[PDB]
Design a protein around this ligand. Structure first.
Ligand code: HEM
Ligand code: HEM
Ligand SMILES: N=C(N)NOCC[C@H](N)C(=O)O
Ligand SMILES: N=C(N)NOCC[C@H](N)C(=O)O
Ligand SMILES: [Zn+2]
Lengths: 416, 414
């Protein structure tokens, strides 16, 4: 039949065609010979640093293209305002080499970039995003203030609200605005003497970087790291977040009274801050965004991954499960009780959280919405399915097509 | 060119060079990835309007022969050069050729090894290959099938096997086994849209009745086989009950579990795939090994469009079915997978849990890295349907491609 990817839902038997992928202008990692679709960081999603300004011709088309998406969203394609804005963009690129977005355009692309994120299962909220314009920012100290305002608004005392703060874009012959940390809120990872790590092994490099930059270290599993904010052509400056601004949740179990005594906890606000935001060819090297957690992110990946808190065994022991044999499914039993702990603790502290069931069910609804609106939705299957109970969620049975659409959130090299 | 692969749990890195030997294309392109698609019309070996191009067949043939002689280390020997002569001579005159039993045995093991969606490929060298290429009727097919079953089952101490029926011939029909597996439970579409038994088998259950089978009305009624000899209507054969080992499910601690009347067969024998070796295609080549507990406990019994027993168990367990946040689904699933492992273990029937299975797969990945410089894997299929990140494979990046010999999907004969 149709000349587009046929996509099927095995639970429902329903069929759809993805026509939206025709819009993709950025190549992926796969070729007809092999699928490189399980690679976390292929050199097809990552945006290398451009030491020199993008070729005027290529910037122009990415820009002309973005403006078109913008006007189509307001339903003024072909209009005088549309054609004028186009002439205005090339005029600016012609004399300066780059151009700038209007306030409403930035808000559009930012929402669009989230909307285009293949690995995000919470895109049913894509329209609800508070875009804080911070393109006026000119110092690392000011970045700190904006971030504190971001955390305050976004955290909203446990009734979290999605938001992103856009700092100045990459400008030729001038350094980038960078947040060295991966997230605004992270736990320190201390490299022990015996070789191990106290805290979060993931954050070991940044922890040592903060120390080398004047940070006075603590020695706990859950120490919140300080921000290492960087302004153009200046070394990064260290800033310590006010404890009152960082809302955390002490984990406890609804039935297993001893879970509380484990001293486990997690911060309520998830804010990626190392990702690059690309809109119409313009690159925003620092633009932290945040929403709310899905239970499995904390209870399974963060707490149970081998290379993270790895608390699976400790909980298994407390539960008195046979940790000597795999066929007892002690890893399965503990993980379920740990996720149940994250859910219970957050629901008690009145902090926002969504479980993997409700989360995937809502993404399916988002998929219907997008089929009607754009004829498809770029989705990364391995990332959409929860790290536990996979086939128990509707998304598992949903085939997905993955591709890159702009605007978008891309990975970028570490500033060091 | 050569994909840099990484394991995020150990931070180790390897370059897959084996992908360079892939000659068949997948559904992916640089514009988009379709790797999560179960069966694209592309890879699928559908029927043909005549005999395959001699040029193409000859090249896939010569290639395979090269593989075999490399395997026995006689690459270059007179026996190697004379087998190429025989194949060239035979293709040039008959438009096809035939395989020696030994080569077919090497092909089948290599087909399994190259299967990207198989997590148990560590056992790839251990395969009993029954040469059934001297079959001329459905009745003979059935006797060969009963032989395969009786052997593979081995009173519960399961062994991996494959029975290879006559290859495909241009202008002639195909030897086909209509059932997707030798052992399956019936799916009776009841009046009110409901489905008694296994929903995934509703169509084949109907085909059997259409062909004269007298159906039951249980949830676990073993289906009869519809075997088809070339250009002939399929025939109905009922498997001898003694041949079909089944395991009654019970929980080690939940006494009421048994009362649910749940059970599942011991032998997983896929009978609808096509085995291609050196350009030749075997439309009927049922193969079997043993179950990984998740296939039964999670997928077969818990999938929405399958038995879908999740809620029932949840209620017996007296869980909070009101909200999704009480994780009742996850809780019921873990106990269901447990009951399976207990039952198959109490009954002395081979079964491997997803933890043991994936650990062995990691080991296999290692062996293959040294052996052939890579290993095609379909991440979504290798990672079990529950506790994904709780297993070593989840944290392993994988490269997926098509190597030959290979098991391919094929159209339904009806
Ligand atoms: C509203 C709540 C949200 C939920 C529950 C949600 C959930 C998730 C989850 C489960 C992931 C997987 C992360 C991982 O496995 O590391 C993810 C990824 C992602 N989300 Fe969302 N998300 C939310 C909000 C947002 C917002 C507000 C943005 C941006 C404006 C966003 C952008 C992304 C991106 C770009 C990724 C990719 C992460 C990566 O590549 O490492 N998400 N999200
Ligand atoms: C030794 C015991 C074996 C175990 C534990 C094992 C396990 C598995 C599992 C869990 C899958 C995925 C099944 C699904 O999700 O539907 C699979 C797929 C498959 N296995 Fe194995 N396997 C074994 C033996 C074999 C043998 C003997 C062959 C071939 C001669 C084989 C060929 C394949 C193929 C081609 C697939 C893909 C199935 C499909 O596409 O539907 N396996 N196996
Ligand atoms: N936006 C959300 N919900 N998460 O984004 C990534 C958060 C990361 N998986 C973590 O667990 O910290
Ligand atoms: N070879 C093995 N183990 N299985 O292959 C598929 C069998 C299928 N998962 C089933 O549930 O019957
Ligand atoms: Zn792909």
């Amino acid at each position: 039949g149709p000349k587009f990817p046929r996509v099927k839902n095995w639970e429902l038997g329903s069929i759809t065609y993805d026509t939206l992928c025709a819009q993709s202008q950025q190549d992926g990692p796969c070729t007809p010979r092999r699928c490189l679709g399980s690679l976390v960081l292929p050199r097809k999603l990552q945006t290398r640093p451009s030491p020199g300004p993008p070729p005027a011709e290529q910037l122009l088309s990415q820009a002309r293209d973005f403006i078109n998406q913008y006007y189509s969203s307001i339903k003024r394609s072909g209009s005088q305002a549309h054609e004028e804005r186009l002439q205005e963009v090339e005029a600016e690129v012609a004399s300066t080499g780059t151009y700038h977005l209007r306030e409403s355009e930035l808000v559009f692309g930012a929402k669009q970039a989230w909307r285009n994120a293949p690995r995000c299962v919470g895109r049913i909220q894509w329209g609800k995003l508070q875009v804080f314009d911070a393109r006026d920012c000119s110092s690392a100290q000011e970045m700190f203030t904006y971030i504190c305002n971001h955390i305050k608004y976004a955290t909203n005392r446990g009734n979290l609200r999605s938001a992103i703060t856009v700092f100045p874009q990459r400008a030729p012959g001038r350094g980038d605005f960078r947040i060295w940390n991966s997230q605004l809120v992270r736990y320190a990872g201390y490299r022990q003497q015996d070789g191990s790590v106290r805290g979060d092994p993931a954050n070991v490099e940044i922890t040592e970087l903060c120390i080398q930059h004047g940070w006075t270290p603590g020695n706990g599993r859950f120490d919140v790291l300080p921000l290492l904010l960087q302004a153009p052509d200046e070394a990064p400056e260290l800033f310590v977040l006010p404890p009152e601004l960082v809302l955390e949740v002490p984990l406890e179990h609804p039935t297993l009274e001893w879970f509380a005594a484990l001293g486990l906890r997690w911060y309520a606000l998830p804010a990626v801050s190392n990702m690059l935001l690309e809109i119409g060819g313009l690159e925003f090297s620092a633009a932290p965004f945040s929403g709310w957690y899905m239970s499995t992110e904390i209870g399974t990946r963060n707490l149970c991954d081998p290379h993270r808190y790895n608390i699976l065994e400790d909980v298994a022991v407390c539960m008195d499960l046979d940790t000597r044999t795999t066929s007892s499914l002690w890893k399965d039993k503990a993980a379920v009780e740990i996720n149940l702990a994250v859910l219970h603790s957050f629901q008690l502290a009145k902090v926002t959280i969504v479980d993997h069931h409700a989360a995937t069910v809502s993404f399916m609804k988002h998929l219907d919405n997008e089929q009607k609106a754009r004829g498809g939705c770029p989705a990364d299957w391995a990332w959409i399915v929860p790290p536990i109970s996979g086939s128990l969620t509707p998304v598992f049975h949903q085939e997905m097509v993955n591709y890159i659409l702009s605007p978008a959130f891309r990975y970028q090299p570490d500033p060091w």
